[PDB]
Symmetry: D2
Subunit: 391 residues, 4 copies
């Protein structure tokens, strides 16, 4: 059972040394008592023996073991933030002449890494609609090396049909590296590796940390891809500090109870918005009628609290200020996955500009909500007051 | 005066809010009270306004301001460790078809980033002897983009003639990006940017942290190179956590008093070793006769505590164990720059293997020492007991 | 609603400075820019102006504000742990010749403070049965200064009729200081100050921290008692470090979701145990028939996850090992309030020895359970396997 | 040598587990794998076996070992701050009817604990001049239980003739508990236990932490007094958090280099002030002619950087502002022991009010300086500019 696993993952005596949680071992230098101990540590430098702090300490090994257990992987690489995990996990598997095929709903920094970093290093990127499914086979080139998924998509929340995408990729290019940014699911509401994806990447910054006060990325790989991920990310110096690794392990323990609340509250808000006369569309994976909802219901074991909706009109700048500047409980900030509720707005052309080779299908202003842990009726009252400011 | 600057750098009321040290502001989300505040934060997202934790919080801004003041730069980028700072600072300035010209005494992970990451991305790397001086001009190619210095060199401690190298580079390729790994000097005993180097990179892991318990990299750039460094490292998601940024600022405050002790003690050990019948050579920048010592004396304002020496014979494996396994005060570990003294050994062929296109000029076993804060006479007694184990 | 209050309590811009959570301001020295500022800080040194780290920094002020809001107090004093809060809060109100009246179900260290510290300073202590209700009036002596409640009681979980106790005290000794150790309710499931109690004390170590990795005590007082508590605790040097204050504020944000799960799961376990053939009695305040349950139902707004039960026999030392050593999910440790489930045994004679002037009314071994966040069916299977080992 | 001891104290493999520094083990709950292990931990709960977080974790045990080694004690008790260490160490040894004899130069909160807390618990306090020496014998009453020393004295810096005081106490009252607040010497420049003092108390807040960002008290006792100190402080719930214990151990490692610089710089400043036409008197234990200097020279192995001087006039409120508000490098704050230089003024009548049963022997404003790690010529220029503002 997931709740029991979240409470126990990575907590073994060699890391906890008698406490409930792993010790915090802060280190660059790790000491070898003898030459033979140094040789053993060198051989096992990526296999959980203390060698050098860039490879990790007991605190990192504990987190890595937890992530491998929960996401069903062979190894877990750590990074300073989610964006670093995306950029470096892609970089680890490409070279001049390769091609990446990425969903057009990918998180904008992920897209910008491809267009602004990879292109000038000789790696091209092509794009696909998130509902392409089996038809992705027609986009696979002789040089396609990586297929990059993000489900639900950023901002607009479209859910892929992962089984159809994976089967089509494997029919054409069985050896391709299929990766997913699995942040919205916190890596646990969608068991990516069990679907035949090779690497599951998360911004642990979001729900794993859970409190908006730490930044970290993770990437959990299957056995086929682990050694390359591990060693290439290490060549770029990617690591996280021991204290944030500790706080990530700590966040796991309450992830189940948090996610259930985020699901219950956000689905109630989505259902209410869907009935509201000032709302044109709700984009929530769990809401019937949302893009790819059928795949969410089939393939996921729950929802988190992030979603968006489209208003029945395009707000003017004055209406945007009247709306956003006067909330009592929702606040404006980037990121998500914490205990508090957040709100942001984007005009349609802003979204179109981050949908490469595509246009958007709406004209109202888009509002992205994160539903936190506040009482849902208080949140509904805040949204209702917002609607009254723009009616 | 440097000691007064180290005590005060980056400590302004907007960061300290009444305490001596900067507050620790842990954040991903940074909240905007109004749409106009969000627009202002966006415009100033790289200029010290709170925007998103990947760009930094007050704690990072304080450290960045300190580093810019102490190294005389226009901006300071932060990284999870020194190796990440090297890899990502080089990556920030290259593209397919470019060439990097790196000292053959560069830190081995820096070399391996070039050969194992850059090459397959279409960026070639050539090598030079650290004492090449003005003759580096003959190695500059039409596509040379970056010239990468490390002075003193890793392990073998050769000091470049930076003025001669910089003048020669600027005669041929005035726009080239000249970078230095300035870790041994802690960025303060050698004021790289004042010599016309564009970017000074450090493993703040070493003397800035000063206690062997935190990992972090920094890169301080001049005005010409800052925007590209900043934005390209950010596209790779490079950052450090707020707590390690705080501990780095904190380390600065004692850096002067620590470095003076490391200099005094390590020079005394070097002078003693130089007279010892079991020592063939001492490689210490401050020791007369060491490679590039004249440039150290001219261009630096002090020494740190890391150096090496070559024994009068090649130790067998049994002698290596008898020597290294039985020290009372020195301990075996990687890294350096902390309060404790460290020892490691390398055979000549191990060094030759990390001296690309070059051979070594010694045949004895090489011993690398970090001289910490212990009483120097106790350290000398420990080294003497070691010599007696192998005589 | 409580959930919204928990998310927002103490989070004002002067403390958060742009982040979601309060900054962490680590300090002894707090700097005065001018003599005028030092004078204002001195006058206001107990009123939330930065003066000296022993009085607090911004991080402490934010926690204190949150605690006063959630428990409805005039001030909140902070302590290194719950036991320090109990000892120092009682000490702050007694003088030689005074008498303390304490429930005989008080936490053992609280009793030991009375019998081993207060007694030698001329302060006597008497005891009362937790169900005494209005009959406490007959035990109040002319010198009774403090009446000390703990509901539910430690280990055996008896719930006091607080309204009846308070009304009796105010009839006989209106000036008495009534205090409660309100740890089981996390200060929020029982609003002690609204019942006429003067001071609500908590080991924030337990549910407020919520992860078994910090220790801290709190004492929230009404306006009548605040100045004496604040100043006398300060004369004993009582404070908490800024980082643990931060972690306590952070624990508040998930306290509602956590407590609801602890209540649900623990009540299911208690209901199962109550029908179990190897169980003689279940002590859970939320279970009908438990001692004081009617008062829990009337006076509390929920339950936490700590409770106990009595086996149908006293286990020998050998049987205790067979039972306790072989659990798969429950662990043996002191404390409680975290994400993991805990088990501890107390023999009936052990409890009798900490029930002064009273006998126990059961003969089997008492098992105290903390029900964490694991799946409850997994926990029931672990208990069932335990029963099979002692049948 | 002390420097080697400071680098190594408390750093045993059972605490460091492969890193240079002790692990940080954050805990309330400490898990017992078996009933046998719980019994052993219970028996040894005050003897360094993991039992419960209030007794300590590995991180505390490492600090305690280091303090006992450096101060030559049988045990070290830890407290939330220096004032808690003083208050609780005295409380641990008194009972109603006892008498405390304290130097009239004691830190004001120490005096206030005696007059405002102990007095109402039946413990009386008398006072002695710091230079009383052997004449203290005449003040010892039959009920004198504690003799409390502080050398140098707070603010005015008078050094006691400890040998003469201790010998007199042992002649009249050999069983008395002799305690010293040894903060100025950081416990290491004056080896109090070697002088026959029973307990050496320190605000580790000051030089041990060394960076003005943590608070912690310590009390190191001889074998005669340890059990009573340990158990009675524990009954008051006194402890420190694991992270601050880590930072205190970490501060030890640089304490020698720091103290040497504080001594050098502060003595240079004191020598300059002593010749200055606007200075009436300099109180620096290392300056010839200061009160008790001969005892400092005989009994201490160095100086720290805190001292004071008396101006040639008493400054009015307006003059205090002109002087103190306009320093460029010195800051106004309480505490001391850190890397930065501090300035505070005390008017002669303010000092007289905290010299019980005594008068002051100076008429000018007293300026207390903490000399940090800044360049001393810069600090002298700042003082000189201050003198120009009040001439
Ligand atoms: C926030 C986000 C990221 C980036 O994570 P950071 O820790 O902010 O760098 C990656 N993927 C998704 C889907 C995100 O929303
Ligand atoms: C240690 C070292 C580095 C790498 O720093 P990390 O923080 O260990 O990644 C970089 N340069 C030099 C010269 C080094 O010695
Ligand atoms: C745990 C306990 C305490 C003591 O708290 P600490 O933080 O462990 O000192 C106080 N009251 C109750 C009811 C407890 O169970
Ligand atoms: C600062 C001070 C203390 C009190 O220490 P805190 O940690 O501030 O409580 C005790 N003794 C002396 C001599 C001091 O100067
Ligand atoms: Br599930
Ligand atoms: Br094609
Ligand atoms: Br399949
Ligand atoms: Br599959
Ligand atoms: Br779930
Ligand atoms: Br963003
Ligand atoms: Br906007
Ligand atoms: Br509504
Ligand atoms: Br200099
Ligand atoms: Br050429
Ligand atoms: Br020049
Ligand atoms: Br130049
Ligand atoms: Br220097
Ligand atoms: Br290495
Ligand atoms: Br070796
Ligand atoms: Br010697
Ligand atoms: Br409510
Ligand atoms: Br003043
Ligand atoms: Br206990
Ligand atoms: Br010495
Ligand atoms: Br037991
Ligand atoms: Br004070
Ligand atoms: Cl975002
Ligand atoms: Cl190294
Ligand atoms: Cl405010
Ligand atoms: Cl307990
Ligand atoms: Cl050991
Ligand atoms: Cl002070």
């Amino acid at each position: 059972h997931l709740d029991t696993a979240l409470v126990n993952a990575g907590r073994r005596k060699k890391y906890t040394q008698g406490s409930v949680n792993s010790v915090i071992q802060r280190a660059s230098s790790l000491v070898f008592d003898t030459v033979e101990a140094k040789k053993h540590a060198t051989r096992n430098r990526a296999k959980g023996e203390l060698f050098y702090g860039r490879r990790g300490t007991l605190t990192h090994f504990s987190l890595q073991e937890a992530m491998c257990e929960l996401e069903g992987g062979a190894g877990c690489a750590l990074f300073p933030c989610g964006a670093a995990a995306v950029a470096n996990t892609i970089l680890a598997f490409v070279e001049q002449g390769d091609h990446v095929l990425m969903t057009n709903t990918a998180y904008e920094p992920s897209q910008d890494f491809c267009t602004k970093i990879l292109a000038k290093l000789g790696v091209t990127t092509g794009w696909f609609d998130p509902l392409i499914g089996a038809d992705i086979a027609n986009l696979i080139q002789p040089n396609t090396k990586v297929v990059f998924l993000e489900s639900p998509g950023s901002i607009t929340m479209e859910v892929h049909d992962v089984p159809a995408i994976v089967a089509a990729v494997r029919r054409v290019a069985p050896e391709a590296i299929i990766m997913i940014d699995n942040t919205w699911a916190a890596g646990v509401l969608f068991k990516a590796l069990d679907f035949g994806i090779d690497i599951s990447i998360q911004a642990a910054t979001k729900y794993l940390i859970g409190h908006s006060d730490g930044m970290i990325g993770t990437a959990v790989a299957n056995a086929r891809c682990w050694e390359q991920l591990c060693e290439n990310a290490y060549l770029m110096g990617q690591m996280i500090d021991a204290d944030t690794a500790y706080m990530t392990s700590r966040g796991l323990r309450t992830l189940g109870v948090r996610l259930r609340q985020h699901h219950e509250s956000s689905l109630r808000v989505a259902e209410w918005l869907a009935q509201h006369p000032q709302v044109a569309r709700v984009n929530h994976p769990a809401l019937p009628g949302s893009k790819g909802h059928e795949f969410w219901k089939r393939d996921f074991s729950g929802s988190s609290g992030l979603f968006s909706f489209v208003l029945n009109k395009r707000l003017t700048d004055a209406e945007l200020a009247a709306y956003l500047d006067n909330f009592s409980l929702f606040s404006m900030a980037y990121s998500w996955g914490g205990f508090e509720s957040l709100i942001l707005a984007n005009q349609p052309e802003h979204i179109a500009a981050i949908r490469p080779e595509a246009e958007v299908d709406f004209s109202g202003t888009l509002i992205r909500l994160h539903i936190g842990l506040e009482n849902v009726d208080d949140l509904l009252a805040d949204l209702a007051a917002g609607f009254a400011r723009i009616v």
